Amino acid sequence: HHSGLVKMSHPSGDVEACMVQVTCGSMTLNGLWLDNTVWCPRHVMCPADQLSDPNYDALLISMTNHSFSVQKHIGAPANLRVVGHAMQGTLLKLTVDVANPSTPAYTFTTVKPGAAFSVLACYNGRPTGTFTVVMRPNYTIKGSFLCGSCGSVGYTKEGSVINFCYMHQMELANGTHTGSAFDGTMYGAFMDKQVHQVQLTDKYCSVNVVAWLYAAILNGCAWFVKPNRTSVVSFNEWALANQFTEFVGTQSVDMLAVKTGVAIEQLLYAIQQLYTGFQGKQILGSTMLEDEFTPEDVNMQIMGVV
Amino acid sequence: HHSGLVKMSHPSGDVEACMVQVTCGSMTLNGLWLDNTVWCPRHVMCPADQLSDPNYDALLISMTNHSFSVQKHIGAPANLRVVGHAMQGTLLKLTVDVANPSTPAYTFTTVKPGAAFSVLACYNGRPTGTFTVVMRPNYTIKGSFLCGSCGSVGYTKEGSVINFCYMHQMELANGTHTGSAFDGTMYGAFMDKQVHQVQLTDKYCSVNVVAWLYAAILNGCAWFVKPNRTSVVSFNEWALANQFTEFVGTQSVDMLAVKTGVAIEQLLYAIQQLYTGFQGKQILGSTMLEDEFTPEDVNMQIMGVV
Ligand SMILES: *[C@H](O)[C@H](C[C@@H]1CCNC1=O)NC(=O)[C@H](CC(C)C)NC(=O)OCCSc1ccccc1
Ligand SMILES: *[C@H](O)[C@H](C[C@@H]1CCNC1=O)NC(=O)[C@H](CC(C)C)NC(=O)OCCSc1ccccc1
Numbered sequence: 001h002h003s004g005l006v007k008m009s010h011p012s013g014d015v016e017a018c019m020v021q022v023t024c025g026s027m028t029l030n031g032l033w034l035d036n037t038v039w040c041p042r043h044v045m046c047p048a049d050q051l052s053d054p055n056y057d058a059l060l061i062s063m064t065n066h067s068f069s070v071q072k073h074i075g076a077p078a079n080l081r082v083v084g085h086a087m088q089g090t091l092l093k094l095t096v097d098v099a100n101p102s103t104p105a106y107t108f109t110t111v112k113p114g115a116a117f118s119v120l121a122c123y124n125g126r127p128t129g130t131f132t133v134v135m136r137p138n139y140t141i142k143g144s145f146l147c148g149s150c151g152s153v154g155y156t157k158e159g160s161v162i163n164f165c166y167m168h169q170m171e172l173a174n175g176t177h178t179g180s181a182f183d184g185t186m187y188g189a190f191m192d193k194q195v196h197q198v199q200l201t202d203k204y205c206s207v208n209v210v211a212w213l214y215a216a217i218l219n220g221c222a223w224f225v226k227p228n229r230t231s232v233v234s235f236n237e238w239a240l241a242n243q244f245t246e247f248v249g250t251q252s253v254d255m256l257a258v259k260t261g262v263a264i265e266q267l268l269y270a271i272q273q274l275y276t277g278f279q280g281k282q283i284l285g286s287t288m289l290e291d292e293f294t295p296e297d298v299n300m301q302i303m304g305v306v
Numbered sequence: 307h308h309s310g311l312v313k314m315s316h317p318s319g320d321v322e323a324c325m326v327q328v329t330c331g332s333m334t335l336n337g338l339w340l341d342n343t344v345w346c347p348r349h350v351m352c353p354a355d356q357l358s359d360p361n362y363d364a365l366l367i368s369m370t371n372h373s374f375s376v377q378k379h380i381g382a383p384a385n386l387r388v389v390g391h392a393m394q395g396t397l398l399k400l401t402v403d404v405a406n407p408s409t410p411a412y413t414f415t416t417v418k419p420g421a422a423f424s425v426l427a428c429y430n431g432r433p434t435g436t437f438t439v440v441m442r443p444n445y446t447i448k449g450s451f452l453c454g455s456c457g458s459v460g461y462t463k464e465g466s467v468i469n470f471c472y473m474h475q476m477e478l479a480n481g482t483h484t485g486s487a488f489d490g491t492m493y494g495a496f497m498d499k500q501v502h503q504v505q506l507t508d509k510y511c512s513v514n515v516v517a518w519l520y521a522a523i524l525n526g527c528a529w530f531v532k533p534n535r536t537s538v539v540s541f542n543e544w545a546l547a548n549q550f551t552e553f554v555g556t557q558s559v560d561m562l563a564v565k566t567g568v569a570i571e572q573l574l575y576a577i578q579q580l581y582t583g584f585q586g587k588q589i590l591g592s593t594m595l596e597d598e599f600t601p602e603d604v605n606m607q608i609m610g611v612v
Pocket of ligand 1: 149
């Protein structure tokens with residue numbers, strides 16, 4: 001039995017219409033054009049001989065409006081003249097002379113560990129792929145980004161409003177990725193410098209494992225459900241010693257409990273048992289715990305509830 | 307180490323601009339608007355009391371142009387007046403009075419087992435998600451489709467040309483999905499009738515397993531590579547008895563062999579060994595063979611080659 005779960009991204013068209021190419025000196029990457037503003041990573045200003053320890057304050061003062069070339073390629077093409085520039089954290093805010101006529105309704109938000117978002121991967125201002133990731137507990141994502149991908153954006157969508165939450169910046173030593181929020185902060189403890197950095201330990205996202213076990217029950221797979229129960233408090237004590245995030249319930253999880261008639265505490269017990277071993281059994285085609293699907297994914301994809 | 311692989315879909319904007327809602331009687335689903343033509347599943351004509359054994363020839367003759375209501379909701383809205391109608395296999399071709407001003411360059415093609423394509427899942431003519439699937443050897447896909455999803459489309463993209471290959475029709479007993487090609491044929495042996503149908507056995511897609519093992523080597527994971535080799539001919543004899551597709555090499559696979567210095571026949575031997583058991587070892591975080599990534603996915607996502 002197929003679970004009915006796929007990695008589901010938002011339709012990307014609203015965001016595709018906002019992507020541009022930004023060039024500064026010897027650097028080119030992507031930017032996001034909303035109203036009269038183009039956002040892009042500030043390391044587009046960095047010469048290759050400074051990438052390991054840039055002085056971004058001095059680089060910013062060294063730029064003029066002529067330092068930046070901004071072009072839109074796909075769809076309605078345009079060359080955008082930069083008329084102001086500013087730095088916010090690890091992002092540049094370029095002011096341009098033309099307002100994007102296809103600016104969607106949008107907000108800026110920060111995504112939290114365990115939450116999913118959609119990524120539009122772009123090179124030279126041209127969208128090339130879309131995928132969805134969950135923010136890991138160590139503030140990396142398991143993405144797919146190559147040279148030239150910086151400035152690619154991540155977002156969620158509520159109704160017609162696009163909530164931009166990620167601008168791609170870098171690849172870590174273990175092949176995961178991180179970037180900035182649109183307040184300019186890097187996710188986690190990372191810095192936008194090309195030097196090796198301490199990377200924190202990842203953890204299983206307990207609330208997403210619970211979601212996946214509910215997806216299994218919703219698919220008729222419940223061999224792991226027992227009368228036994230572990231309290232949230234007891235589970236969370238256990239989680240700290242076993243590389244799991246502490247569990248915090250949500251109405252999304254509560255809907256899954258009501259639909260299945262299986263209590264959260266039953267699944268917290270099952271996780272503890274499954275972590276010691278699946279004993280050769282499979283859950284939704286897997287012999288290990290899955291934490292890349294959220295309670296919202298399961299509600300939406302299986303239960304039809306948004 | 308993260309593999310650098312995600313489920314990567316095409317940007318969906320070009321196709322979003324083609325989706326419409328088609329209503330006929332008590333049925334509503336999605337259609338695809340290209341030039342002056344709207345394509346949709348023919349069971350939109352079926353009354354609920356005929357779904358198990360429709361007479362589609364008689365249903366078609368019973369329709370007039372007034373029988374169909376076609377509306378575009380998102381983006382540039384329009385109500386489209388139907389001025390002709392026709393049946394091609396399991397699809398209707400509605401001719402409308404307005405040509406889609408955002409018709410992309412496009413072709414129609416049929417996708418083959420093991421090949422990947424992008425799906426734009428739509429409800430009531432509104433795109434709601436995108437995901438990528440591989441056509442299974444039994445001509446189903448492991449999708450995520452609910453009531454109202456019929457007429458959702460699947461496609462590949464070469465350059466700027468969209469190759470439409472799938473229009474969603476139905477869900478099988480094991481939760482997988484199938485649909486039609488735009489020549490109107492159902493994939494596999496399926497019929498667009500709401501009756502239980504024999505479903506063929508699925509198989510591992512050997513060429514995609516080889517691709518994934520190459521992805522592992524490209525990530526520094528090669529413990530399973532041994533000097534031993536199995537010829538393509540010998541492997542394919544073995545595959546028929548062990549629920550694998552027969553392996554057919556491509557230039558995409560050959561590039562992976564050249565890049566890694568590991569021969570295809572070495573990986574065919576490794577597959578045979580891994581199928582008997584991983585012996586507690588992991589490959590790219592998995593204890594089972596992965597066949598949902600193509601040689602092209604690995605070339606593109608890891609090697610940067612399109
Ligand atoms: C921008 O397009 C690019 C994106 C990466 C290239 C390969 N895949 C990517 O995701 N970003 C960069 O090249 C980074 C620029 C810095 C922030 C100024 N540098 C980068 O990712 O270098 C990685 C090695 S340095 C490092 C090592 C370990 C932990 C942190 C940083
Ligand atoms: C169209 O929106 C809809 C899509 C499915 C609804 C639930 N998820 C879907 O993918 N398609 C239908 O409802 C089908 C209409 C037929 C083709 C006229 N019917 C359908 O999928 O019924 C499934 C039960 S009948 C069946 C059982 C086993 C094998 C084949 C068919």
